[PDB]
Amino acid sequence: FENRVAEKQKLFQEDNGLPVHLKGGATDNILYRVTMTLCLGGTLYSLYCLGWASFPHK
Amino acid sequence: ITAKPAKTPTSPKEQAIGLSVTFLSFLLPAGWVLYHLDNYKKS
Amino acid sequence: STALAKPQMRGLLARRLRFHIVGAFMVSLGFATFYKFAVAEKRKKAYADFYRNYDSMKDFEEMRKAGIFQSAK
Amino acid sequence: APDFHDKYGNAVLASGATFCVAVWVYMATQIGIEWNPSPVGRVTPKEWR
Amino acid sequence: HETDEEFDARWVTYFNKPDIDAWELRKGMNTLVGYDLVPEPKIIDAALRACRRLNDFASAVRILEVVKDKAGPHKEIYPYVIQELRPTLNELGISTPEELGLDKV
Amino acid sequence: PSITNKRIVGCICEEDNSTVIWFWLHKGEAQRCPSCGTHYKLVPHQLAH
Amino acid sequence: HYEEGPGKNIPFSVENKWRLLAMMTLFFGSGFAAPFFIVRHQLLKK
Amino acid sequence: MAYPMQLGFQDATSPIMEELLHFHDHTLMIVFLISSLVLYIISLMLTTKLTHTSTMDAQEVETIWTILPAIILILIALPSLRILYMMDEINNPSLTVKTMGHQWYWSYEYTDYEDLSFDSYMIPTSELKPGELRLLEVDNRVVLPMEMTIRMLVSSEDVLHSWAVPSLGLKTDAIPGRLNQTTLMSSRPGLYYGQCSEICGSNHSFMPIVLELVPLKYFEKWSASML
Amino acid sequence: ASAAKGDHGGTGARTWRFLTFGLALPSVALCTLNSWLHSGHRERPAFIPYHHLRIRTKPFSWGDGNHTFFHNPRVNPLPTGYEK
Amino acid sequence: MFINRWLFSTNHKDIGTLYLLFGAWAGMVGTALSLLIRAELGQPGTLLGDDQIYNVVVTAHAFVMIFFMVMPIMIGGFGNWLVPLMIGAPDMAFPRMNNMSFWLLPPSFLLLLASSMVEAGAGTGWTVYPPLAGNLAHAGASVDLTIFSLHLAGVSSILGAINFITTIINMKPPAMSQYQTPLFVWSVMITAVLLLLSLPVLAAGITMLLTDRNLNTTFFDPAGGGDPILYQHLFWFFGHPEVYILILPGFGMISHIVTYYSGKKEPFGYMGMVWAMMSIGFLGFIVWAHHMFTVGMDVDTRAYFTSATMIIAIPTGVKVFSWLATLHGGNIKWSPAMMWALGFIFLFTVGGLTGIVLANSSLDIVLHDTYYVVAHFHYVLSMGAVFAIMGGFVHWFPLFSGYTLNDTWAKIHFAIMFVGVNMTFFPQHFLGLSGMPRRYSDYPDAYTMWNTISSMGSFISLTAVMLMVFIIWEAFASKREVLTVDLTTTNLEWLNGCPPPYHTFEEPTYVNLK
Amino acid sequence: SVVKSEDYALPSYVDRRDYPLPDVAHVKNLSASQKALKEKEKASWSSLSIDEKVELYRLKFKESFAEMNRSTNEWKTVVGAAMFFIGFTALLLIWEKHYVYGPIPHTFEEEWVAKQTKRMLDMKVAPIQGFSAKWDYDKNEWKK
Ligand SMILES: CCCCCCCCCCCCCCCCCC(=O)OCC(COC(=O)CCCCCCCCCCCCCCCCC)OC(=O)CCCCCCCCCCCCCCCCC
Ligand SMILES: CCCCCCCCCCCCCCCCCC(=O)OCC(COC(=O)CCCCCCCCCCCCCCCCC)OC(=O)CCCCCCCCCCCCCCCCC
Ligand SMILES: CCCCCCCCCCCCCCCCCC(=O)OCC(COC(=O)CCCCCCCCCCCCCCCCC)OC(=O)CCCCCCCCCCCCCCCCC
Ligand code: HEA
Ligand code: HEA
Ligand SMILES: CCCCC/C=C\C/C=C\C/C=C\C/C=C\CCCC(=O)O[C@H](COC(=O)CCCCCCCCCCCCCCCCC)COP(=O)(O)OCCN
Ligand SMILES: CCCCC/C=C/C/C=C\CCCCCCCC(=O)O[C@H](COC(=O)CCCCCCCCCCCCCCC)COP(=O)(O)OCC[N+](C)(C)C
Ligand SMILES: CCCCCC/C=C\CCCCCCCCCC(=O)O[C@H](COC(=O)CCCCCCCCCCCCCCC)COP(=O)(O)OC[C@@H](O)CO
Ligand SMILES: CCCCCCCCCCO[C@@H]1OC(CO)[C@@H](O[C@H]2O[C@@H](CO)[C@@H](O)[C@H](O)[C@@H]2O)[C@H](O)[C@H]1O
Ligand SMILES: C[C@H](CCC(=O)O)[C@@H]1CC[C@@H]2[C@H]3[C@H](O)C[C@@H]4C[C@H](O)CC[C@]4(C)[C@@H]3C[C@@H](O)[C@@]21C
Ligand SMILES: C[C@H](CCC(=O)O)[C@H]1CC[C@@H]2[C@H]3[C@H](O)C[C@@H]4C[C@@H](O)CC[C@]4(C)[C@@H]3C[C@@H](O)[C@@]21C
Ligand SMILES: C[C@H](CCC(=O)O)[C@H]1CC[C@H]2[C@@H]3[C@H](O)C[C@@H]4C[C@H](O)CC[C@]4(C)[C@H]3C[C@H](O)[C@]12C
Ligand SMILES: C[C@H](CCC(=O)O)[C@H]1CC[C@H]2[C@@H]3[C@H](O)C[C@@H]4C[C@H](O)CC[C@]4(C)[C@H]3C[C@H](O)[C@]12C
Ligand code: CUA
Ligand SMILES: [Cu+2]
Ligand SMILES: [Mg+2]
Ligand code: NA
Ligand SMILES: [Zn+2]
């Protein structure tokens, strides 16, 4: 292996106004959208589950 | 503490409205449930 | 056209505190004395007086005759 | 220059106190609330057995 | 700490500094009123004259007001102080808050 | 030192005081601690060349 | 960056006192009402 | 039992409960004294135009307000601990009775000689006989001999409960798998009430305890007849 | 553990003095209170000439050779029992 | 921008604001639950149903008031807002983790509401003791949802504690020693240390209840050699420190309020105040079994816990007398905040003293599980903790918002609340001494009078809570912008204006070492 | 005179009994006649008129001590309003008793209470101080 930290330091210090969680590139955006979609979707699903469990199925 | 006069003064009439609305927001829903308590207890 | 006497001008707050703390102490003592008479002693004498010539069998007999018991009619 | 308190203070105190006393006395004695006071001095013991 | 006379002397000396500036005047009065005492007339005299050297009439009057205030419910203090300060008030031409109507709400 | 024309100063008047005296120090003539009178003077700007 | 100052460092708007009254009413009212409706829910199950 | 508008403790039925009444009077005096002293000092600090806003020294007055409370705490702890150990004293009972807590009633067992046991349920309000107390009466009372040292063993066959009789100064938790001991000794005959003192579910408010204290002779005939 | 206090921003002389007078000495004062309370001479037990106690395989190099170094008449019996 | 600012925040002020909003909403829920309690007890008989629905209400009331109202407001709200400003720090040490501490609360609250929605709720008492809380006496998801709610609230507070301790130790000006930080900052650090040490034990304990309920373990089940009393020890080992966690930040705010409105530059006996809070924090970890005086413990163990418990009165006493000593000689400003603080001093003292009565295991035999305990804790919580919160709220509201409240209305609010809480709880002392048990949906006829009066007092408090909402609305509706604040030389949090800018102390304060 | 929001970093004026001499003068900007008064102030104060002295005071300070320490009628408003809201609370209680609460248990009926009271006296409830102790068993009445 070779030391490529300087390349990474240049990329992450590039003045493009991007927050650190998106500064790596397009993949950050994809990973973020997947994470947030699973989180919000899963939360809606948990609310549905609570609605289901709230009522007796005799 | 010193402060400047109100930028959007709330007159006595406006305060009566805010106080009334505030009290009603607490009293009405609970009052409704409490009033229909018997209808709930056995139904 | 009379002059005025130099009054006390130093430690007036401290002087006031001292006076009233001493008064608070005196009132605490008077309350202790009162309480240990209207409550403490009153209680000890009420129990001592009640049990002095207490007859438990007589008491039971009265309760029995009144019919309060399940085991004794 | 007279403020809210100078103008309305006495009225607010007077009618506030009056209203409070009136409505509480009414609630306490005219609506069927059971306070369940002590029988001591008020109830004449009646045969139960 | 120190004796009453050493305290007073320290204060009189403070206000008597010929070139005392406005800041030092305020600092002295603002600090002095924090103690459990009404300043002796000799202290007040020195402060009033410092006001004269600083051409500050308003502060002279305010100092008289704070003396009265520090007495709290002891109404016999202020009139005695004003009595002891009369020669100075006359000399400097300082009108008491009462004479200016600043004692009325 | 300051990179602007005012900076908050905290003065621990005497060693071991638990109370810190806080005040804004402005560009210009030296100011004194409201409590002990020690002098402070702002010397503005630069840092980053 | 963000807005600063009175009425700007909050997640709700205070531009209109009446719209604000409505918001506060729903906010605090929903909190206070919740237990009553949960009690009602428990009573209407069995 | 408690009577309408009661302020303090139910009258003491046992010597230990009498002991607690005197200890409480002692402590309450201290509570009144200190709380009124604080209220008084607050009013004292707030009622003067005189001021002293400069730095005040503390290492002198802190001795007073550290030593005094320390002394007062000791004056409470002494009689407190004396009573505590007194309640633990070896007494040697004449009788042992067990009580098992259940989801919503108490069962009793007197198994020294015979195998006597029964359930004790609250009398429903709709079935109370005239003059009977709502929520407090039971169908089968705990008959016990008066003026005698009795050992009560408490446990539970389901959840936690707590066996209490205020007039006697008793409260022993009923824990499944555990046998807790307490001693009972009534100075007088009569009926003494208590209520379950550990949340146990749906009818926690409705599983009272009623002790019936009678002379030994009646206790024995009652025992025989209850077989 | 972390105790239930806090400081740690810089443990110095002032802090250790604070601990000395605010925690350590008060603890010693309490234990001194507790001890000079639960004291009181306990009733000495009946003497039983157990063979595993009051051992004497060689006389002590002091006194009459039969008394232990810090012998207390009130609570230490000799091999033959308590003293007069 | 809205989402970036309010959902992705890394700002201590905005996060403190979220906490204050959450805590205010939780307070409404907790108040409603307390009214349901007092409505059921307002007259003899059954109103709602049996002890199950009743105790589901009592349990939730406690969890909501403690975990969702008091802690979030005092620590998350006032703590986040004031701590960095009081030490001149640019933000908290872990600004992003700080945001997760907040966001764990809504989910935690949702789990608590879920537990009361499914099955028959968790009517266990906030202590959640087994076997009642076990899978046989409380079968179904309710108790498990309650445990999970506590887990989330626990993680939130533990991460919050790590953040506060690190910030307070590591981010003060280089010249400022720990003995130069304000008392509120000290109260928060000590509180954080208690949270750090106590919550993991509770987590251990409730995880064991969860496994007993779902994985067939038997930590608290005698059938497998377990013991219900073990749970009590683990719970109370956390439980007592928890009550000091609820009052410590209150003590901190009281010190600032009393000092401020007495026109003083500093509280009387600063080092004695620090000593007292640390002692209280320490002693609070070795007295837990005073919650177990009737479970059947050895007499010597009971003698120890009685004695250790009483000692706390000494350091607490130094604080009370120091607050009075701070008032001494002051130029008293009778502001609404000062009124809350004065009420706090007296009412907390009363509650503390009844706590000393309860410390006596002998007397506690008769007082345990009765309304005497309820009276004690409501005096220190509903009067102590709540008055400190109200005082701090009225005092700092202008700082947080940039607007002033109407002082007259705020004094009216205090008057109503004062009558309300005292009428509600004072009579409960009588009910306790005379034997009324805790967690009862109905009571023997003799207890009617005091229960009637107590329920009426609770309605007076409801009126004060509704008025409070209106007061806050009036402030925001009128928009009276703050100009000047006095005593900034000894109250750094006000030095950057009202409200301070998003970013404060970008250029740190200058403090000489001399 | 007129204070601004963004002036929080600058020395300000305050009227306080314990801080008699504020950091700044109440009025900093002077008119032609006011400037002239400040000049006249440099000469003997004996030459200054009462009106001029009052004006010099008013330039330096906003309120006199008498003015700033004045008491008000606010307490009337506070106490009266508190009572009105406490009174309003009773209306909520009236509503509750009427629409929410059903009848109380039959054990509160007068006849039941009279019987229950005799029974309590028969079982000698609280005979030392609390209840039975207040009944005269000999004269068969409540002790006078
Ligand atoms: C639950 C929310 C209620 C919904 C109502 C909102 C409707 C939006 C319409 C939408 C119409 C669009 C209008 C847009 C702008 C204004 C409204 C706003 O932006 O909308 C939302 C904003 C603003 O909030 C409001 O809307 C009004 C609040 C007014 C508060 C006044 C508070 C005064 C006290 C002082 C606080 C400190 C400030 C002082 C200092 C100043 C700060 C520096 O909130 C937030 O984004 C963050 C708050 C998060 C959490 C707080 C507690 C929630 C607990 C929930 C747990 C539930 C568990 C299950 C529970 C399930 C129930 C069964
Ligand atoms: C609303 C309740 C109505 C109750 C009416 C009582 C009826 C009397 C029948 C009159 C009938 C007389 C015959 C009865 C005698 C039986 C004596 C006994 O064996 O029973 C003993 C019992 C009974 O108690 C008594 O021996 C009476 C004491 C009453 C104290 C009343 C204070 C009232 C303050 C007013 C508002 C309350 C909130 C104030 C807060 C005080 C905090 C506790 O003792 C207790 O354990 C109860 C109190 C417990 C704990 C409080 C400790 C701190 C008190 C602080 C005082 C501040 C004063 C400043 C002045 C207070 C300024 C605010
Ligand atoms: C040797 C000593 C004797 C000296 C005699 C006095 C001389 C005075 C020197 C003189 C020393 C200086 C005094 C004056 C300074 C400034 C006066 C003024 O310019 O400013 C005017 C202000 C100033 O206010 C006052 O000034 C007095 C108000 C005091 C409120 C204290 C609240 C305390 C809460 C904590 C309780 C425990 C401690 C209480 C302790 C209180 C101690 C005073 O006027 C108000 O409007 C505010 C008060 C409003 C309402 C009362 C509070 C409600 C309490 C709860 C019950 C409500 C029942 C009603 C509702 C009823 C419904 C049923
Ligand atoms: C804010 C919360 C808070 C605080 C600070 C306290 C503080 C104290 N508590 Fe309380 N307590 C609770 C909340 C609180 N408590 C809760 C919620 C419960 C019930 C839990 C449940 O079961 O659900 C409870 C239960 C409880 C019990 C168990 C009772 C039982 O269940 O049978 C005991 C036992 O000793 C007790 C004691 C104390 C003591 C001695 C203090 C001390 O810290 C108080 C010290 C203060 C003072 C003493 C006053 C000021 C001092 C002076 C003016 C000096 C002079 C004083 C003397 C010389 C005495 N508390
Ligand atoms: C902090 C804790 C807290 C608070 C404040 C309260 C407040 C109140 N509680 Fe309490 N209560 C408990 C904690 C609390 N309680 C606990 C721990 C239990 C025991 C549970 C168990 O047994 O398991 C209990 C039990 C309990 C019982 C006993 C139940 C039983 O044994 O059957 C009763 C009975 O009357 C009761 C009543 C009330 C009432 C009427 C109030 C009223 O005083 C409430 C009035 C309203 C407020 C004081 C809230 C105001 C605050 C806000 C709304 C925030 C405002 C916003 C900002 C300033 C930002 N509570
Ligand atoms: C007060 C607390 C401090 C303890 C020491 C103080 C005084 C004692 C004198 C010297 C002790 C030094 C080391 C310990 C050696 C032997 C144990 C002594 C501990 C002690 O003092 O024990 C006492 C016995 O004394 C005895 O025999 C004591 C007889 C004295 C004989 C000393 C014999 C010396 C043997 C030394 C061997 C040393 C070899 C050292 C090697 C080091 C490494 C090379 C106990 O008294 P007791 O009456 O039996 O019971 C009390 C009944 N009321
Ligand atoms: C349950 C147990 C508790 C019960 C009771 C405890 C109450 C204690 C009662 C009395 C305390 C007596 C303290 C004595 C201090 C003297 C006060 C004084 O006068 O205050 C200052 C001393 O500084 C100083 O100690 C600092 C100023 C005052 C120091 C002490 C003030 C606080 C007193 C307590 C406040 C009330 C709260 C009590 C709590 C119960 C004054 O300074 P000097 O005169 O040098 O300078 C002035 C200039 N000269 C020289 C010209 C006069
Ligand atoms: C299923 C039953 C209940 C489940 C509960 C689950 C709860 C949460 C799960 C999801 C959380 C995971 C996400 C990662 C969290 C990492 C936090 C972290 O690593 O936080 C760090 C701080 O804590 C530090 O260092 C040191 C501290 C590190 C803490 C690591 C966080 C772990 C979370 C769990 C903790 C459990 C509590 C343990 C006690 C029993 C960094 O601080 P930041 O503010 O980010 O940055 C500051 C910048 O200057 C850094 O460049
Ligand atoms: C503890 C917190 C609660 C405190 C007490 C609440 C204070 C009173 C609030 C009033 O609320 C209501 O009052 C009603 C009656 O006064 C109801 O009307 C109802 O009753 C009727 C009139 O008798 C009908 O006209 C309608 O069908 C009706 O639902 C009603 O729904 C409810 O909103
Ligand atoms: C920014 C927002 C987060 C909102 C929030 O914090 O509550 C994020 C960013 C990207 C995500 C979205 C992604 O674009 C993927 C999803 C698929 C669709 O193409 C649009 C909506 C969609 C379902 C998502 C909704 C949105 O709310 C997400 C989850
Ligand atoms: C490639 C690298 C040399 C440094 C470099 O990257 O230039 C070498 C040096 C030491 C490392 C090795 C170490 O000797 C330890 C390991 C030993 C081997 O048995 C397996 C791989 C092993 C896990 C490592 C893999 C290897 O590729 C490493 C990573
Ligand atoms: C030594 C330490 C800090 C002093 C300082 O560095 O300023 C001070 C702070 C608080 C003091 C303690 C508190 O004042 C409480 C106690 C008061 C008694 O007067 C002596 C012991 C007592 C336990 C004090 C001992 C010691 O003087 C402490 C612990
Ligand atoms: C309560 C706890 C046991 C918890 C459990 O059963 O799991 C026990 C463990 C050790 C006990 C302590 C230690 O045995 C030492 C002390 C012994 C004394 O007899 C009483 C207090 C004393 C300080 C004990 C109090 C209490 O019983 C402790 C703290
Ligand atoms: Cu059985 Cu409660
Ligand atoms: Cu505890
Ligand atoms: Mg219990
Ligand atoms: Na009921
Ligand atoms: Zn300085």
Q: Report CA A6 to chain centroid distance, whole Å.
A: 26
Q: Exposed, middle or buried: residue C2 (CB in 10 Å: 0-12, 13-18, 19+)?
A: exposed
**Burial environment of residue A15 by CB neighbours within 10 A (0 to 12, 13 to 18, 19 or more):** exposed
Subunits in contact with chain K (3 or more CB pairs closer than 8 Å)? B, C, D, E, F, H, J
Residues 6+ apart with CB under 8 A from J357: H24, H27, H28, H31, J363, J367, J372, J376
- CATH number for G1-46 (one of 4.10.49.10, 3.40.605.10, 2.40.50.100, 3.30.750.24): it is 4.10.49.10
Across the interface, whether the CB atoms of F9 and J88 are under 8 A apart is answered no
Please report, for residues H99, J38, J139, the alpha-carbon distance to residue J130 in angstroms, rounded to integers and kept in the order given.
20, 26, 12
> Please, which residues bridge with residue H108 across strands?
H99, H118
Determine if ligand 2 sits within 6 Å of the CB of residue J429: yes
Q: How many Cβ atoms from other residues are within 10 Å of residue A55's Cβ?
A: 12
Q: What are phi and psi of J277, to 5 degrees?
A: -70, -40
For ligand 1, say whether the CB of G6 is within 6 Å of any of its atoms. no
Distance CA H202, CA H205 (A): 8
d(CA H25, nearest CA chain J) in Å: 11
- Give CA–CA dist H171/H10, Å, rounded: 14
Three-state DSSP class for residue K62: coil
Q: What are the structure tokens assigned to J40, written together? A: 């059921």
Tokens of J319: 């604080």
* Upstream peptide bond of J131 is cis (omega within 30 degrees of 0): yes
The residue with tokens 């229950």 is K116
Q: Is the dihedral of CA H126, H128, H131, H133 positive or negative?
A: negative
Residue J483's H or E segment, with its range, is strand J482-484
The radius of gyration of chain J's CA atoms, rounded to the nearest angstrom, is 23
H1/J444 Cβ within 8 A:
yes
Say whether H146 counts as a known binding-site residue.
Answer: no
For F5-37, the DSSP string reads SEEEEEE--STT-S--EEEEEESSS-EE-TTT-
In the DSSP assignment, the letter for residue K6 is G
- Domain containing B9 equals 1-43
Could you tell me if H179 and H186 are in contact, meaning their C-beta atoms sit under 8 angstroms apart? no
Contacts of H162 (CB under 8 A, 6+ apart): H101, H171, H172, H173, H174, H196, H197, H198, J294, J369
Within a 10 A sphere around the Cβ of J39, how many other Cβ atoms?
A: 21
- Residue range of the domain that includes E43: 1-105
Judged by DSSP in three states, H35 sits in: helix
Spelled out in words, what is the top-level CATH class assigned to the domain A1-58? few secondary structures
CB neighbours of C22 closer than 8 A, spacing ≥ 6? none
Q: Are J373 and J294 in contact (CB under 8 A)?
A: no
Q: Are H109 and H180 in contact (CB under 8 A)?
A: no
What is the rounded end-to-end Cα distance, in angstroms, of chain A? 65
Work out the number of other CB atoms within 10 angstroms of the CB of residue G28. Answer: 25
Query: How far is Cα H28 from Cα J353, in angstroms, rounded to an integer?
Result: 9
CATH of the domain at K48: 1.10.442.10
Does an H or E element contain J127, and which? none
Q: How do strand H150-156 and strand B2-3 relate by DSSP bridges?
A: unpaired
CA separation (Å) from F40 to F19, H96, J258, J503, J511? 18, 84, 31, 25, 11
| Widest CA span in chain K | 100
Query: Which single residue is written with the structure tokens 């749906």?
Result: H202
CATH number, residue E2:
1.25.40.40
- Classify residue J181 by its DSSP letter: S
**DSSP letters of J53-119?**
HHHHHHHHHHHIIIIIIIHIIIIIIIIHHHHHHHTT-SS-SSHHHHHHHHHTHHHHHHHHHHHHHST
Q: Are E38 and E63 in contact (CB under 8 A)?
A: no
- Report long-range pairs for C3-6 (Cβ below 8 Å, ≥24 apart): C3/E83, C4/E76, C4/E79, C4/E80, C4/E83, C5/E80, C6/E80
Q: How far apart are CA F31 and CA H146, in angstroms?
A: 87
As for how many domains chain K has, the answer is 1
Q: How many CB atoms lie within 10 A of CB J299?
A: 14
Residue H23 CA to residue J204 CA, distance in Å, equals 39
Task: Tell me which amino acid residue H136 is.
Answer: L
For J289, which DSSP code? G
How far is the C-alpha of J368 from the C-alpha of H20, rounded, in Å? 14
User: In G, residues 5-34, which contact J (CB 8 Å cutoff)?
Assistant: 5-7, 9-11, 14, 17, 20-21, 24, 27-28, 31-34
**Who contacts E7 (Cβ-Cβ below 8 Å, separation ≥6)?**
E1
Q: Are H10 and K126 in contact (CB under 8 A)?
A: yes
**Backbone angles phi and psi of J287, in degrees to 5:** -130, 5
Nearest CA in chain K to C47: K128
Helix/strand/coil (H, E, C) string of D1-49? CCCHHHHHHHHHHHHHHHHHHHHHHHHHHHCCCCCCCCCCCCCCCCCCC
Instruction: Choose among J144, J462, J416, J395: nearest CA to J252.
Output: J395
**Distance separating alpha carbons of residues J8 and J14, to the nearest angstrom:** 10
Which residues does chain A break after (C to N > 2.5 Å)? Answer: none
| Separation of alpha carbons J392 and H78, rounded Å | 40
Question: What are the structural domain ranges in chain C?
Answer: 2-73
Q: Which residues line ligand 12 (CB under 6 A)?
A: H 62-63, 66; I 14, 17-18, 21-22, 26; J 271-272, 275, 318
Tell me the residue type at E2: E
> By the CB < 8 Å criterion, does J509 face chain D?
no
**Strand ranges of the sheet holding H105-110, from the earlier edge strand across to the other edge:** H116-120, H105-110, H95-102, H150-156, H180-184
Contact J428, J374 (CB under 8 A): yes
CA distance linking residue J399 with residue J403, whole number of Å: 8
Structural domains counted in chain B: 1
Sequence-separated (6 or more) residues with CB below 8 Å from residue C70: H140, H141, H143, H212
Alpha-carbon distance of J460 to J455, in angstroms, equals: 9
Which ligand minimizes its atom distance to the CA of J230?
Answer: 13
For this PDB entry, the determination method is X-ray
Ramachandran angles phi, psi of J313, nearest 5°: -60, -30
Residue K141 parent element (H or E): strand K141-142
DSSP per-residue string spanning J389-418: HHHHHHHHHHHHHSB---HHHHHHHHHHHH
Q: How many domains does chain D have?
A: 1
Q: Does domain H92-227 fall into CATH 1.10.1050.10? A: no
Axis-axis angle for helices J313-327, H61-88 (nearest 10):
150
Q: Helices J299-311 and J336-359 sit at what angle, rounded to 10 degrees?
A: 160
Q: Is B19 on the interface with G (CB under 8 A)?
A: no
Enumerate the β-bridge partners of residue H143.
H212
Whole-angstrom Cα distance, residue J406 to residue J468? 11
Tokens matching residue B33: 């449930």
Closest CA to A23 of A10, A38, A40: A10
| Rg value, chain C, Cα | 30
CATH 4.10.93.10 for domain C2-73, yes or no, is yes
Alpha-carbon distance K113 to K115, whole Å? Answer: 5
Q: Could you give the CA distance from residue I1 to residue J205 in angstroms, rounded to a whole number?
A: 18
**Domain of I44?**
1-84
| CA dist list (Å): J476 to B8, B19, G22, H213 | 9, 14, 13, 68
3-class secondary structure, J322 = helix
Question: How many CA atoms lie within 13 Å of J396's alpha carbon, on the beta-carbon side?
Answer: 32
Domain range enclosing J417:
2-514
CA distance to partner chain C, nearest, from residue K122 (Å): 6
- Partner E contacted by K17 (CB < 8 A): yes
- CATH code assigned to H2-91: 1.10.287.90
Take residue H133 and report the two structure tokens written for it: 């107390």
Does G40 lie at the interface with A, CB-CB under 8 angstroms?
no
Using the atom order of ligand 14, give the atom closest to the CA of residue H197.
2
Q: For chain D, first and last CA: distance in Å?
A: 76
Structure tokens at I29: 């004062």
Pair of tokens at residue J277:
């809070």
Q: Tell me the DSSP string of A1-58.
A: ----HHHHHHHHH-SS---TTTTT-HHHHHHHHHHHHHHHHHHHHHHHHHHHHTS---
Find, in chain J, the residue whose alpha carbon is nearest to that of D9.
J408
Only one residue has tokens 């006597």, namely H116
Cβ of H52 and E34 within 8 Å? yes
Tell me the nearest-neighbour CA distance from E91 into chain H, angstroms: 31
Residues with Cβ within 8 Å of J54's Cβ and at least 6 positions away in sequence, in order, are J37, J40, J48, J123, J439, J441
H198 in contact with ligand 14, CB cutoff 6 A? yes
Q: For residue J437, what is the DSSP state?
A: B
Give the residue numbers of J annotated as catalytic, written as ranges. 61, 91, 126, 156-157, 240, 242, 244, 255, 290-291, 316, 319, 438
> What is the rounded distance in angstroms from the CA atom of residue J506 to the CA atom of residue A51?
48
Query: Would you tell me how many other CB atoms lie within 10 Å of the CB of residue K70?
Result: 9
Task: Give chain H's radius of gyration (CA, Å).
Answer: 24
| Helix residue spans in J127-227 (DSSP H) | 142-170, 183-214
- The span from the CA of J278 to the CA of H8, in Å, is 36
What DSSP designation does J130 have? T
